Amino acid sequence: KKLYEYTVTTLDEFLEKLKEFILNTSKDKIYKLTITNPKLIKDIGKAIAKAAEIADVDPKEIEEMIKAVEENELTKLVITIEQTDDKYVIKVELENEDGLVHSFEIYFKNKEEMEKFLELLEKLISKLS
């Protein structure tokens, strides 16, 4: 069981760490990526929400995640990418200056579906100018 944490300060860093996660050979692996640049928070949060829409995640969950991404005084996005036990999950936490955190999970049935989602996220982030 391995937990890695990174502070992500550019879009290229975000793409690099998704790659590192996929290529990590551990059976049980967790990467936690922290983003504090509000412009990058919105870029990446909107990309996750769009990827979730394409993946047919619960529409009300996506609507709530967009609400969090659009909220005033956003200060932190934390993305936890987890493969452990029988679970394949991405957790999204959006935090504001007042310390209020909204959290969301996106589950996958297997490893292949999770890596396909991560590749979708990379494609969406790559389109950004």
Side-chain angles (χ1 to χ4, degrees):
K1 204 182 154 93
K2 35 164 56 182
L3 169 70
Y4 287 85
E5 285 171 18
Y6 302 103
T7 297
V8 164
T9 67
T10 73
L11 291 176
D12 277 353
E13 285 188 0
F14 187 71
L15 295 176
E16 162 65 24
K17 299 292 172 213
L18 302 187
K19 159 174 80 73
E20 293 184 19
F21 174 86
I22 290 167
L23 295 179
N24 182 309
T25 57
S26 299
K27 162 182 163 293
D28 300 313
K29 47 176 180 182
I30 303 163
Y31 281 42
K32 283 188 111 76
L33 311 181
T34 292
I35 298 106
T36 61
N37 179 338
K39 190 238 145 193
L40 298 184
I41 291 172
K42 282 198 84 302
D43 284 344
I44 294 164
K46 274 215 223 137
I48 292 172
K50 179 60 193 210
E53 184 181 74
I54 291 160
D56 282 338
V57 168
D58 173 36
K60 316 206 334 293
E61 182 182 338
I62 299 171
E63 293 166 4
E64 294 297 314
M65 186 201 303
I66 293 164
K67 188 171 147 169
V69 171
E70 301 278 6
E71 80 189 14
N72 296 330
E73 292 173 11
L74 265 187
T75 202
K76 196 187 298 203
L77 162 67
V78 182
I79 302 157
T80 302
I81 309 175
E82 170 165 7
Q83 172 181 298
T84 55
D85 294 355
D86 290 342
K87 321 168 18 176
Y88 302 91
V89 61
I90 296 163
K91 183 184 197 173
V92 175
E93 294 173 275
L94 289 148
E95 182 179 17
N96 67 21
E97 272 161 32
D98 285 357
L100 184 67
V101 182
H102 291 95
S103 71
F104 312 89
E105 290 96 23
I106 297 170
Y107 291 87
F108 306 93
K109 75 178 185 166
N110 60 24
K111 180 190 258 253
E112 171 162 67
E113 289 313 306
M114 189 177 176
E115 318 186 319
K116 281 187 180 134
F117 186 91
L118 297 176
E119 278 310 314
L120 184 52
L121 193 45
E122 284 153 18
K123 293 181 222 118
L124 288 166
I125 289 295
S126 276
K127 283 270 119 153
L128 290 182
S129 77

